């Protein structure tokens, strides 16, 4: 899943792994009974150009201090980093059943360097292989696989760098999960209810962006949601799909409610999230939850070396 | 989900709950957390006629000894009961070339009374409510709800009967999950591999009947599956469909391998299954897994008297 504020932490882990594999002349990896041949990379720049869509827009001078990769990108993009981490989409609430209202307006749209599309920020780990179009494994699990290779084969120093990269990813992915309001769906109901209680949050059914309705916990910010006339106060989703915008009602969607993301709720959620992940999830949010879980728990895959029988080509097996 | 060998145990639990609710003039149940109005039933025959698709085919004289309901159906259907519990579908295996082969032949097709279709055995617990269009709770969780009402509000005698019924359902649902070979999909991978090692099973990708390919553990009976000439030994799936059936090859699919369901593997699986359900199952197998889980653990829902008067209500704390 794409996230411009963690993408080069993820890219660094993939490079650390290929550096180790190439140092050891390991040319293929077995993943679930299938053999995948590694592309060979000449250096960081070669690798980045292959796996990261935004490579040529930024032309960063990345070096072998991996803990500085993301911060090199952060320095180019300045305010966008924090604004992304803290950003959320439009929040719609349907009080009666037949009309949805915009109750919280989306964060301001971000403009990245070169007007880059979000998808350019993806680190395509599958491109580390020369024939992985058949590889079913998701991005978090590939990140886990390459992490596991670094944990297994890396020096004590590399293992320390890996743990810093993983923590970096965890911090910002979790803060984004909280800031968007997506955390409630990803965590189990009873644990979410307790966090809501402890943080004076209000549970509603709502739409985040164009997603289907989900449990969302908002800070009602001193309002009794039973007592608001939404039709007088906020625009309908229907109105928005044309130019039927009441300027005052759009203004109200900046002022009434909040998605809470302060350090208290962050600490509350971090304390409970990994060990209380809700089972049924899909798409981006599932990759999100899995990334957070993995980067927190750091339970690595076992990496087996295959016996070089004919003293020929070296390979390893994962899972 | 349907199962002719447990259906009237499930049906009995629903009736025990509604008998308790009507005795106490309780008219609605809050669930997640909408309120659902109960239908009222005059007697067992009224109830069974509403919830059980097969009621009018069997016309059983069910009484208020609930531990005799399923056994009265078992007596009508005789051999079909054990043959269903122990039964499995065709098992197809593709050794890696262009064709899949029938490696284990299905258990003989069963003919129930009136040649009933399987779906007619369903106990539709949602029919206990007059308004359950908006109820998204599934069968196992409804059975768990009605069981919880019996445990919470029932007499000691009714609780004892409930416990017998839950155990009957657990025995037969679990033995069916094992006998079909479905258990592997339903349980976590590391635990399935443990069980396979303990029972000398072989892990293959296979298809059970017409379902999509899944992980199946077979007892290879000491045969080396790498050394078999499948095309000389077994019927292809396409030939089977087209009824081009070499009788010796079909006979091989009765004799080579089996789906292990002996008491050794049943006890092994029972000891580990409910604690280790695969988090990624859906539909019919998920209902099977949940039914087994609940009838094993018996951790009932909290049932609150919401009350208040004049309309008496209860709330399933869930």
């Amino acid at each position: 899943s794409m996230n411009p504020t963690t993408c080069l932490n993820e890219g660094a882990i993939g490079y650390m792994a290929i550096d180790i594999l190439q140092s050891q002349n390991i040319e293929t990896i077995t993943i679930n009974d299938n053999e995948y041949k590694l592309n060979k990379f000449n250096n960081i720049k070669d690798y980045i150009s292959k796996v990261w869509g935004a490579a040529s827009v930024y032309n960063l001078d990345l070096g072998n201090d991996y803990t500085k990769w993301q911060s090199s990108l952060d320095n180019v993009e300045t305010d966008n980093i924090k604004n992304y981490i803290n950003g959320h989409d439009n929040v719609y609430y349907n009080p009666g059943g037949k009309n949805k209202y915009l109750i919280i307006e989306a964060s301001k749209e971000l403009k990245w360097k070169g007007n880059l599309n979000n998808n350019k920020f993806n680190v395509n780990l599958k491109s580390i292989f020369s024939n992985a179009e058949n590889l079913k494994v998701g991005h978090s699990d590939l990140l886990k696989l390459f992490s596991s290779i670094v944990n297994s084969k890396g020096s004590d120093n590399q293992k320390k760098v890996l743990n810093s990269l993983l923590d970096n990813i965890n911090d910002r992915r979790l803060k984004k999960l909280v800031s968007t309001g997506q955390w409630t769906e990803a965590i189990s109901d009873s644990v979410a209810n307790e966090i809501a209680k402890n943080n004076k949050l209000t549970s509603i059914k709502a739409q985040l962006g164009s997603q289907k309705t989900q449990n969302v916990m908002i800070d009602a910010n001193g309002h009794d949601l039973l007592k608001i006339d939404y039709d007088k106060t906020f625009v309908t989703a229907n109105d928005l799909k044309n130019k039927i915008i009441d300027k005052n009602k759009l203004e109200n969607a900046k002022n009434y409610f909040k998605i809470q993301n302060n350090d208290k709720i962050l600490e509350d959620i971090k304390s409970k999230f990994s060990k209380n992940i809700n089972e049924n999830i899909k798409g981006s949010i599932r990759d999100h939850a899995k990334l957070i879980e993995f980067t927190e728990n750091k339970k690595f895959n076992t990496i087996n070396d295959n016996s070089n029988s004919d003293s020929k080509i070296k390979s390893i097996t994962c899972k």
Side-chain angles (χ1 to χ4, degrees), chain A residues 129-147:
Chain A
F129 304 102
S130 62
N131 297 305
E133 105 286 3
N134 266 9
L135 185 52
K136 63 286 194 72
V137 167
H139 176 75
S140 191
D141 289 337
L142 275 191
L143 182 66
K144 184 166 165 187
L145 157 69
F146 289 118
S147 298

Side-chain angles (χ1 to χ4, degrees), chain A residues 9-10 12-17 20 66-67 143-170 294-295 298 300:
Chain A
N9 291 311
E10 304 168 35
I13 293 172
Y15 191 77
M16 294 180 75
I20 291 165
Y66 301 119
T67 71
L143 182 66
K144 184 166 165 187
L145 157 69
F146 289 118
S147 298
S148 298
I149 288 170
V150 184
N151 162 255
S152 180
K153 286 178 164 303
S155 75
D156 283 350
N157 285 335
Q158 291 167 324
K159 276 144 59 85
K160 189 173 181 183
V161 168
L162 170 71
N163 278 318
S164 299
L165 293 176
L166 292 171
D167 289 342
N168 283 358
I169 294 165
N170 188 265
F294 166 58
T295 56
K298 299 169 187 149
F300 301 105

Side-chain angles (χ1 to χ4, degrees), chain A residues 4 57-58 71-82 111-116 121:
Chain A
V57 171
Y58 290 105
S71 57
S72 293
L73 171 57
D74 296 342
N75 285 338
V76 176
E77 288 287 0
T78 59
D79 305 280
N80 282 338
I81 298 301
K82 181 177 90 176
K111 307 173 239 79
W112 300 90
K113 180 174 183 175
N115 290 265
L116 282 159
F121 286 104

Side-chain angles (χ1 to χ4, degrees), chain A residues 13 58 67 82 128 153 174 208 213 247-248 307 319:
Chain A
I13 293 172
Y58 290 105
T67 71
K82 181 177 90 176
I128 287 170
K153 286 178 164 303
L174 178 65
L208 311 173
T213 66
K247 284 301 168 56
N248 286 12
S307 165
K319 247 40 169 193

